[PDB]
Structure 1
Amino acid sequence: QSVEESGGRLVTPGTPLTLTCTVSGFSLSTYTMNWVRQAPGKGLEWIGDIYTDGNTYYANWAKGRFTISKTSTTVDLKITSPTTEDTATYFCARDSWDASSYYGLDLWGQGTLVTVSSGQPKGPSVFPLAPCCSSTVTLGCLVKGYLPEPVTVTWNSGTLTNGVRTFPSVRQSSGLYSLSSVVSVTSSPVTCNVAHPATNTKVDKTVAP
Structure 2
Amino acid sequence: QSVEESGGRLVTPGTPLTLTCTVSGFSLSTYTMNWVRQAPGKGLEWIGDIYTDGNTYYANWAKGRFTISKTSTTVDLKITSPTTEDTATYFCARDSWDASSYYGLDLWGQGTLVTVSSGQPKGPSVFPLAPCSTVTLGCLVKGYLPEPVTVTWNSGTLTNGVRTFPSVRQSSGLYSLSSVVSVTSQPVTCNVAHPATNTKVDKTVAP
TM-score by length of 1: 0.98
After the TM superposition, list the runs of 4 or more consecutive aligned residues in structure 1 that deviate by more than 4 angstroms: none
The 5-angstrom pairing of residues 24-173 of structure 1 reads 24-131=24-131, 135-173=133-171
What is the CA deviation profile of residues 23-69 of structure 1, one whole-angstrom value per residue up to 9, with x for unaligned ones?
00000000000000000000000000000000000000000000000
- Contiguous gaps of at least 5 residues in structure 1: none
Q: Secondary structure at the match of 2:201?
A: strand
Q: Secondary structure at the match of 1:85?
A: helix
Give the Cα separation in 2 of the matches to 1:143 and 1:56. 43
What is the CA deviation profile of residues 155-183 of structure 1, one whole-angstrom value per residue up to 9, with x for unaligned ones?
00000000000000000000000000000
Q: Secondary structure at the match of 2:196?
A: helix
Give the Cα separation in 2 of the matches to 1:16 and 1:143. 31
C-alpha displacement of 1:187: 1.7
Which residue of 173, 176, 181 corresponds with 1:175? 173
C-alpha displacement of 1:15: 0.0
TM-score by length of 2: 0.99
Give the Cα separation in 1 of the matches to 2:25 and 2:148. 30
Give the Cα separation in 2 of the matches to 1:19 and 1:188. 45
C-alpha displacement of 1:188: 5.1
Q: Secondary structure at the match of 1:61?
A: helix
Give the Cα separation in 1 of the matches to 2:153 and 2:53. 51
Give the Cα separation in 1 of the matches to 2:119 and 2:186. 43
Aligned residue pairs total: 206
What is the CA deviation profile of residues 106-140 of structure 1, one whole-angstrom value per residue up to 9, with x for unaligned ones?
00000000000000000000000000xxx000000
Q: Secondary structure at the match of 1:46?
A: strand
- Contiguous gaps of at least 5 residues in structure 2: none
Quote the residue 1:199 is aligned against. Answer: 197
Give the Cα separation in 2 of the matches to 1:90 and 1:20. 10
Give the RMSD, CA atoms, in angstroms. 0.4
What is the CA deviation profile of residues 76-124 of structure 1, one whole-angstrom value per residue up to 9, with x for unaligned ones?
0000000000000000000000000100000000000000000000000
Give the Cα separation in 2 of the matches to 1:81 and 1:94. 25
